[PDB]
Amino acid sequence: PLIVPYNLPLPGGVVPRMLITILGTVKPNANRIALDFQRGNDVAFHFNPRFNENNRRVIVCNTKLDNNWGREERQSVFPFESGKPFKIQVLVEPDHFKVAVNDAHLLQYNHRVKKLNEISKLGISGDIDLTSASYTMI
Numbered sequence: 001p002l003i004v005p006y007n008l009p010l011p012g013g014v015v016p017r018m019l020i021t022i023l024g025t026v027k028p029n030a031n032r033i034a035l036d037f038q039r040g041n042d043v044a045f046h047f048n049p050r051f052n053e054n055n056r057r058v059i060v061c062n063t064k065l066d067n068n069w070g071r072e073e074r075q076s077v078f079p080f081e082s083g084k085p086f087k088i089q090v091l092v093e094p095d096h097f098k099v100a101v102n103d104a105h106l107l108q109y110n111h112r113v114k115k116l117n118e119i120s121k122l123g124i125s126g127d128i129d130l131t132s133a134s135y136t137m138i
């Protein structure tokens with residue numbers, strides 16, 4: 001497998017029709033998963049499934065600019081399960097990141113960081129075994 005935290009370069013950054021596919025297994029007793037699309041120190045798109053936030057499972061999305069978190073966008077649909085293999089697909093669209101999990105549309109995140117060509121790293125972290133992380137152009 002791959003080592004977590006894992007950082008995947010996005011050469012020349014992200015562009016519409018770029019599809020990123022993450023395969024992994026959620027650890028038993030997992031607490032968190034995080035995908036961080038980075039523009040230098042800023043986090044353009046933080047995708048953060050939380051398995052126990054006040055005894056609820058929730059996905060938090062946010063952007064971090066100059067070390068400051070913005071308005072969180074929370075999704076209560078939680079297709080992840082401890083112990084079980086997942087597929088995360090992030091499709092870059094002109095106005096948002098489109099996320100599907102195990103082939104089901106999960107959420108959309110309107111681009112707050114506008115310089116898409118400067119979002120050049122994807123950090124992958126959390127309580128998972130990482131099987132594969134790749135991108136393609138569709």
Ligand SMILES: OC[C@H]1O[C@@H](O[C@H]2[C@H](O)[C@@H](O)[C@H](O)O[C@@H]2CO)[C@H](O)[C@@H](O)[C@H]1O
Nearest residue numbers: 046048060061062063069070071072073
């Ligand atoms: O917004 C993503 C960001 O959240 C941080 O935790 C927040 C928490 O979600 C919020 O409910 C609370 O009031 O403030 C905390 C600190 O901002 C996480 O620490 C961070 O990892 C990100 O996931």
